Design a binder for this molecule. Structure first.
Ligand code: Y01
Ligand code: Y01
Ligand code: Y01
Ligand code: Y01
Ligand code: Y01
Ligand code: Y01
Ligand code: Y01
Ligand code: Y01
Ligand code: Y01
Ligand code: LQ7
Ligand code: NAG
Ligand code: NAG
Lengths: 554, 142, 40
């Protein structure tokens, strides 16, 4: 490590560690620094060989390590993060190819292991790391966005068993959903527990907790709507106090998430949405408490309505695990570019047409609201099939228009010496016809075509992304207190007040996998040429012996 | 001639359910928000559902909900009390002018129309196209 | 029988024929060596 370590590689690794850093980068950096200045020498040699781009040597070293799947996942993560900082174009392909090769190696090895013994494979998956990188296979794959390793049948089956908890995975969903409502049905044999104590087992499953939370959230939305529409007064009544109490526990959970995590927690969109919703709710309360002034009450009601929109739009996110709507919701976020292109073209045409029509119809409006109403809103409504109107003198009437701006009506069209409108129809009518043709028909059909193409293209790997997100959500639900939402405040208060057989089997399966790879390579069946050459050599030797015998005879 | 197409017809329920789910979410949100920011304490369930569900539902077919702009609003159709069978009048301020601001209602309805009438229908068309393409291989067998 | 014919359509018997020819050549060489030994 002191002398043979490449100086360029040393400098690059130092820069990456000091700049980016990570749970694994710090460990490898510290190990390298210690050596230059469980011991795990094989892991150190593997890291030394892999950081210097030695594919064959790295593969040879890999076959000697005890934990091979974890080592391969760590190597893939390390190569990906190193390439994320590299600027050279040529090396960017080599590093990516090597990382993909190691990910494929890990996937194949785990598939071989799982096909032999599921229980041992799951134990290996959960097997804690002996300070390799501070994390196990699942966490490394997630941090390395190795979707293939998470999407294979074994990991999905393990996650399903963890998700259903005690209840047998081979239990009809509708039966358990029905049993959730009627409690006494749990005692009956409708629900299995293959995996009183039955109640605890049923209510400790994250599946049931998620279902209960969904039910309570729907009830919360119903109560919110009722309060907004039918029971809103100067002084809040009991239902609104209940609503505040329910929001309080959500705020406490948000604060707990802020405490466990940091600023990175705000990277995600939905966390930001939740924080904005809670802040809007608090602002609405502040405005509402001013019972003396009615304008404050109306402002609070408006704030509550907007916050209700925000709350209601979260059902799309929460229902991304149903396994029928989930993939489609996931694909939904893959169509922003088409929408932006459509909006760009539509806005260009809208601005052009509106400005032209307003200029050739009316002069010197001097009011901004009506300017934008005629230039933007009315042409925008044409997207839905209604003609802007006011382009033909026949249908135009002077009752709706005002010669002066004192009233709240559109300005009258410019009139000539004889008090007749001055604009010519032979340019206005074709203008609106062309605008309608371009916007209502061509743009919408083009958007439909682009959506069709995008749907066709992205359906190949949508299930993989859905499975990755499913793992994320399942782990999130299993990580927390795993208690129904309305009854989590008690847990918070109480906790605040109070608070190697597997490796040998892995090596054997690794040897078996290597033997299988060797057999697949040797399946070429090119030994016929070697056999023919051996036969020819034997024939030549026999001929030489015969010649020697003939010479001896004479 | 029609048999295979009828058979394939029953292969498109999931897309319809997804479309209805998204549309219902948006419909509920928009209707509740508009009713809350326009009128207070209706106390009648029939008109509550009429304004919250039926009118936004009609937007799927290309008609704007209306009542979002003060210019087109008229007090003849509305009733200050619930005795008659008419929608409740918008909340009025000290000077007897409607109180709701247009600069949030109008963008709200524009966004709702954009999301529902156009994006959802086109997405449904695309999903139907993909499903038709995929399932035509073995439809004759069924 | 048709399945067997389809399987046998590989047409890999050329190697077997070559091996048989090589064995026959080896036998002929052994016979020639024996004849030479008998002569001397
Ligand atoms: C209290 C009243 C007003 C609510 C009645 C409305 C029902 C239509 C809602 C209430 C609870 C909902 C259920 C709550 C939990 C689930 C499980 C969920 O399925 C999964 O979790 C699949 C997990 C997987 O295998 O990936 C799909 C939604 C469903 C059936 C929801 C469907 C709609 C239900 C029945
Ligand atoms: C300048 C004025 C007109 C303000 C406009 C703001 C709106 C355009 C914002 C407010 C609430 C936002 C929404 C909150 C919820 C959602 C659903 C969400 O849908 C998905 O991401 C599907 C995929 C998934 O979530 O799994 C995308 C963002 C969106 C439209 C957000 C983006 C746009 C909205 C409507
Ligand atoms: C009328 C106003 C005053 C109150 C607003 C009512 C809505 C908040 C409730 C009423 C019925 C609810 C719906 C009942 C059933 C469903 C289907 C459910 O989707 C599934 O069941 C998927 C399950 C699967 O994929 O297998 C998602 C929620 C939804 C739309 C519920 C969401 C919220 C709704 C629309
Ligand atoms: C494919 C798209 C883009 C072309 C649109 C086809 C028609 C809708 C347009 C093409 C030319 C238009 C005509 C151009 C000029 C006039 C005269 C105009 O009457 C006048 O001359 C106004 C002054 C007056 O005499 O009082 C009435 C409409 C008309 C027939 C227009 C009506 C609609 C026409 C036939
Ligand atoms: C007297 C005659 C010979 C003049 C030419 C007649 C047609 C060839 C003109 C009349 C209306 C024109 C159309 C008016 C609007 C558009 C949309 C335009 O679309 C775009 O370029 C991007 C914006 C969008 O897609 O909407 C393409 C041309 C087209 C069909 C124009 C192309 C040529 C058209 C058909
Ligand atoms: C007007 C009120 C008071 C009475 C209602 C009349 C309908 C019950 C009848 C009138 C004519 C009938 C139609 C006459 C012809 C056809 C086409 C037929 O389709 C085919 O011929 C397919 C054959 C093929 O695929 O080759 C299906 C029934 C339908 C729609 C018939 C179904 C019932 C209809 C619409
Ligand atoms: C809660 C309220 C709004 C009651 C709503 C009930 C309707 C939605 C039901 C009543 C009659 C039903 C229909 C009777 C006939 C048909 C045609 C049928 O079409 C096919 O299956 C095509 C394939 C084939 O049949 O070979 C599907 C069910 C449907 C729509 C049934 C399901 C939905 C309908 C319209
Ligand atoms: C791409 C989509 C989602 C955006 C929608 C584009 C336009 C239809 C919207 C964007 C902002 C809207 C404007 C926001 C604020 C106002 C002021 C409003 O007049 C008032 O100020 C009401 C109070 C009063 O002065 O009496 C009239 C509509 C207008 C121009 C709105 C009309 C339509 C606009 C231009
Ligand atoms: C002052 C400016 C910089 C604010 C941002 C302007 C635009 C980027 C906003 C204005 C209106 C927004 C749109 C309003 C509604 C929708 C539908 C929404 O669709 C969904 O997420 C699922 C529901 C569905 O598909 O309808 C996606 C975002 C989009 C196009 C929003 C994305 C962002 C838009 C174009
Ligand atoms: C606008 C808003 C703000 C906070 C919470 C919600 C509801 O969100 C859910 C609804 C149903 C099921 C689970 C969730 C959900 O993920 N959390 C975590 C939120 C992470 N920030 C809320 C939960 C509290 C206790 C168990 S779960 C909505
Ligand atoms: C300077 C000005 O605003 N004048 C108008 C006047 O023309 C109009 O008759 C009156 C009633 O509409 O409102 C005002
Ligand atoms: C308590 C009550 O219902 N009062 C109304 C009253 O305001 C209205 O004038 C009358 C005729 O519409 O119907 C009734």
């Amino acid at each position: 490590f002191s002398t043979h370590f490449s100086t360029l590689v040393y400098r690059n690794l130092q820069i990456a560690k000091n700049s980016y850093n990570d749970a694994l980068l710090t460990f490898v950096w510290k190990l390298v620094a210690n050596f230059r200045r469980t011991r795990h020498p094989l892991q150190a040699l593997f890291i030394w060989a892999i950081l210097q781009n030695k594919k064959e040597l790295s593969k040879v070293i890999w076959e000697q390590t005890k934990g091979c799947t974890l080592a391969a996942l760590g190597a893939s993560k390390l190569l990906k993060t190193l390439a994320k900082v590299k600027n050279d174009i040529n090396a960017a392909g080599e590093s990516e190819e090597l990382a993909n090769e190691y990910e494929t190696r890990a996937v194949e090895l785990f598939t071989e292991c799982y096909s032999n013994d599921e229980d041992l494979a799951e134990q290996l998956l959960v097997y804690s790391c002996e300070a390799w990188g501070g994390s196990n296979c699942l966490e490394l794959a997630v941090e390395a966005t190795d979707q293939h390793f998470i999407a294979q049948p074994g990991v999905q089956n393990f996650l399903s068993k963890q998700w259903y908890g005690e209840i047998s995975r081979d239990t009809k969903n509708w039966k358990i959903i029905l049993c959730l409502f009627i409690i006494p049905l749990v005692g009956c044999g409708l629900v299995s527990f293959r995996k009183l104590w039955y109640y605890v087992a049923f209510f400790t499953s994250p599946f049931v907790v998620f279902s209960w939370n969904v039910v309570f959230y729907i009830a919360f939305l119903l109560l919110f709507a009722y309060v907004l529409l039918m029971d809103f007064h100067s002084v809040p009544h009991t239902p609104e106090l209940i609503l505040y109490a329910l929001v309080f526990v959500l705020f406490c959970d948000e604060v707990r998430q802020w405490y466990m995590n940091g600023v990175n927690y705000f990277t995600d969109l939905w966390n930001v949405m939740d924080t904005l919703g809670l802040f809007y709710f608090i602002a609405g309360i502040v405005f509402r408490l001013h019972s003396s002034n009615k304008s404050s009450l109306y402002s609070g009601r408006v704030i509550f309505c907007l916050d209700y929109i925000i709350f209601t739009l979260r059902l799309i996110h929460i229902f991304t695990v149903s396994r029928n709507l989930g993939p489609k919701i996931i694909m939904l976020q893959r169509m922003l570019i088409d929408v932006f292109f459509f909006l760009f073209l539509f806005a260009v045409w809208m601005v052009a047409f509106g400005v032209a029509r307003q200029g050739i119809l009316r002069q010197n409006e001097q009011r901004w609201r009506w300017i934008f109403r005629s230039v933007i809103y009315e042409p925008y409504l044409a997207m839905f099939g209604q003609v802007p109107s006011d382009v033909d003198s026949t249908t135009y009437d002077f009752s709706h228009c005002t010669f002066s701006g004192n009233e709240s009506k559109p300005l009258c069209v410019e009139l000539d010496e004889h008090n007749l409108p001055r604009f010519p129809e032979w340019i206005t009518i074709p203008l609106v016809c062309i605008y309608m043709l371009s916007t209502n028909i061509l743009l919408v059909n083009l958007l439909v075509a682009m959506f069709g193409y995008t749907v066709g293209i992205v359906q190949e790997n949508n299930d993989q992304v859905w499975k990755f997100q499913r793992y994320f959500l399942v782990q999130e639900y299993c990580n927390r207190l795993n208690i129904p939402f309305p009854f989590v405040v008690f847990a918070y208060f109480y906790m605040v007040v109070k608070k190697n057989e597997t490796l040998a089997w892995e090596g054997v399966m690794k040897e078996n996998y290597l033997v299988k790879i060797n057999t697949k390579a040797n399946d070429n069946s090119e030994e016929m040429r070697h056999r023919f050459r051996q036969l020819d050599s034997k024939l030549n030797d026999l001929k030489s012996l015969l010649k020697e015998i003939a010479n001896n005879i004479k």
